[PDB]
Amino acid sequence: NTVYVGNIDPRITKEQLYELFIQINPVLRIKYPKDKVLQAYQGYAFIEFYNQGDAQYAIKIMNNTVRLYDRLIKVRQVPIAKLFIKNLADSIDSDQLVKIFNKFGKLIREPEIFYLSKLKCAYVYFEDFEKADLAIKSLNNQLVANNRITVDYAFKNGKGNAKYGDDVDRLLN
Template sequence: MNFSTDSDSTVYVGNIDPRITKDQLYELFIQINPVLRIKYPKDKVLQTYQGYAFIEFYNKEDAEYVIQIMNNTVKLYDRLIKVRQVTNSVGTANLSSNNSKDIALPIAKLFVKNLADSIDIDQLAKIFGKFGKTISKPEIFHLSNGKLKCACVYFEDFEKADLAIKSLNNQLVANSRITIDYAFKENGKASTKYGNEVDRLLNKEALKHGMLK
């Protein structure tokens, strides 16, 4: 299937620092909506990126939402990236201000393993809340046919999540030794965890612009 640069599901991304790789662009934008494909041209002689890219999403609504969230809000290596919709007409598409879709911004998602049976959601929230603000209540679930109690915890920023990992990993909580690490991404590459360089850059910008409140 050919890449389409005039589709209403494709966005143009400009003012990209040449140090940003194609993989980093993917990691950045997939946190907002699933990415179908990326066209990121290189100079044929120098083999360096030319500072712009076309990113195609699965539908028009996803593309519009990315523009709404990303345009003039994210700095990468001190460059404020520009994101606009690619259309056959001049100008950008009109965006709805009543989009009810949940924002998939780069919060710090932790995976907690081997919790004691006595630990509930409120207790877990209290334990992790000592290290910083969390976005929502923890989610508790069971693995290994119900034998292994686990949870996901969502911090507002990575510094607080780093501190929680450093302080609690391999520690006894309610007589059970827990392990904590960044969770794997559900919609990214199978081996990719939260907390990489792009996650942290985007998280700082989101906090700066009040997008996580």
């Protein structure tokens, strides 16, 4: 219900802000942070309306509309499976990783290739712990691109606890 405001003159006072934005919509509160060191505001604010619709409408109407001391005001709005894999082949592109792990599970993000020791390793993000269980079951200690690869859980000691299965199960559901 709160909208961000920016490009504010430090000479602007909370009174002037309120008088401005009440024209658009009823404003529940205005948090307009000040530096208590210098007693000087930082040129931005947070304006909390009563509901969301007033916030969105205010964003639409008041963005880049008004110049306060020539300054044009800005108005704006404002946990997953992971697998460590070791001994990868240098011929394996991240896209080839994607094609490998898609059949096992849907990737929430892209894998991350990093070198340890020289030693090609990667992190693979799955949306499911069970799909990752399939990826480990089939892919663990398996020869691809003429190189034996090891698939396990990435450390945090690693993922795959019981609470991990429960809360990941919930985040999926």
